[PDB]
């Protein structure tokens, strides 16, 4: 079967003996990549992460999430020091921590641009689907089935606040949890309105995220590699969604998981197993010889 293989653009399996770069560090998306469809770390992945720690391979989360929601999803592994959150790349790079919890990237959204996005979202009536991200907290203006769906997956509940409170908040991103039926059209409106203003990414499903135009996960990758004096050629990135494209195309070694879209796969050097098939375990086997 093809379930567990990693292959190049020609469809040929990647062989360790043909690799000339040691992989010292792995950057991975969380939902859709490391976590299976139940948002759990499979036992096969966990076993391989334990071996990677024994061998001194660093595994770094790179996610649209805040560190707070990451801790709520994978906390049991963090508590056992099986997955480290520091260093880590959060809010699509706009908050990137070194191992001391210091932000080596802090990209706040300009406040005028924040209010312009806010006003536009009210004008097209997606404001009710907005989750606004501050450094330590998230906010929404109401609760509906789409906010509910967001909360259940995110596993961290935003505070409900009034409209006029947004002006006083210092924010990094906004995430719209959209109805499927309006996703495609809303994505077009946001991208047309905000090009060369802000990043617009459909990260998973009907979620649309807006965050600092000049920042992305790859900016975090560069900062963390720099920290440890690791050449980019010794780093590997793996991912599934649009917010992974820059880090997949920015590194020579990168793995799109099988469940990723063609656009995401195209940006990656290699295609691996799906997130339900223990992708990082097989990445560790292929690149690091387990």
Ligand X SMILES: O=P(O)(O)OC[C@H]1O[C@H](O)[C@H](O)[C@@H](O)[C@@H]1O
Q: Which is nearer to Mg ion, 36 or 48 (CB)?
A: 36
- 108-115 long-range CB contacts below 8 Å, 24 or more apart? 108/170, 108/171, 108/172, 108/212, 109/171, 109/172, 109/173, 109/198, 109/211, 109/212, 111/167, 111/170, 113/197, 113/198, 114/166, 114/169, 114/171, 115/166, 115/167
Residue sitting closest to ligand X (CB):
63
Cα separation values, 219 from 106, 141, 163, 214, Å: 11, 31, 32, 9
- Interface pick for ligand X out of 108, 113, 134, 153 (rule CB under 6 A): 153
154 is a site residue for ligand X (CB under 6 A): yes
> Taking CB under 6 A as the criterion, which residues in 158-177 touch ligand X?
175
> Taking CB under 6 A as the criterion, which residues in 109-148 touch ligand X?
none
- Interface pick for ligand X out of 87, 241, 256, 272 (rule CB under 6 A): 241
199 is a site residue for ligand X (CB under 6 A): no
Q: Which is nearer to ligand X, 175 or 232 (CB)?
A: 175
The three-state secondary structure class of 268 is coil
Q: Which is nearer to Mg ion, 127 or 272 (CB)?
A: 272
Rounded to the nearest whole angstrom, what is the least distance from the CB of residue 204 to Mg ion in the complex? 5
- Interface pick for ligand X out of 36, 243, 254, 286 (rule CB under 6 A): 243
Q: Which is nearer to Mg ion, 23 or 245 (CB)?
A: 245
């Amino acid at each position: 079967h093809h379930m567990h293989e990693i292959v190049d653009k020609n469809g040929k399996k990647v062989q360790k003996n043909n690799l000339n770069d040691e992989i010292k560090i792995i950057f991975t998306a969380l939902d859709g990549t490391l976590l299976n469809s139940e948002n759990k770390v499979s036992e096969q992945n966990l076993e391989s992460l334990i071996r990677a720690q024994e061998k001194g391979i660093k595994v770094v989360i790179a996610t649209g999430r805040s560190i707070f929601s990451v801790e709520n999803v994978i906390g049991e592994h963090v508590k056992k020091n099986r997955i480290s959150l520091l260093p880590g790349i959060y809010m699509n790079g706009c908050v990137t921590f070194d191992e001391k919890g210091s932000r080596v990237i802090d990209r706040i959204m300009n406040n005028d641009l924040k209010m312009e996005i806010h006003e536009f979202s009210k004008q097209i009536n997606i404001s009710k689907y907005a989750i606004w991200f501050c450094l330590e907290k998230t906010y929404c203006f109401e609760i509906n089935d789409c906010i509910r769906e967001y909360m259940e997956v995110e596993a961290l509940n935003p505070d409900v606040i009034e409209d006029n409170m947004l002006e006083g908040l210092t924010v990094y991103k906004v995430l719209f949890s959209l109805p499927e039926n309006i996703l495609e059209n809303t994505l077009k409106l946001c991208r047309e309105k905000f090009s060369h203003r802000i990043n617009v990414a459909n990260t998973f499903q009907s979620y649309v995220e807006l965050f600092h135009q000049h920042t992305n996960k790859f900016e975090g990758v560069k900062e963390i590699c720099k920290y440890y004096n690791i050449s980019l050629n010794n780093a590997l990135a793996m991912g599934d969604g649009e917010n992974d494209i820059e880090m997949l195309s920015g590194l020579t070694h990168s793995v799109g998981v099988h469940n990723a879209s063609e656009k995401v796969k195209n940006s990656a050097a290699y295609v691996g197993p799906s997130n339900n098939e223990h992708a990082i375990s097989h990445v560790l086997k292929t690149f690091c010889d387990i």
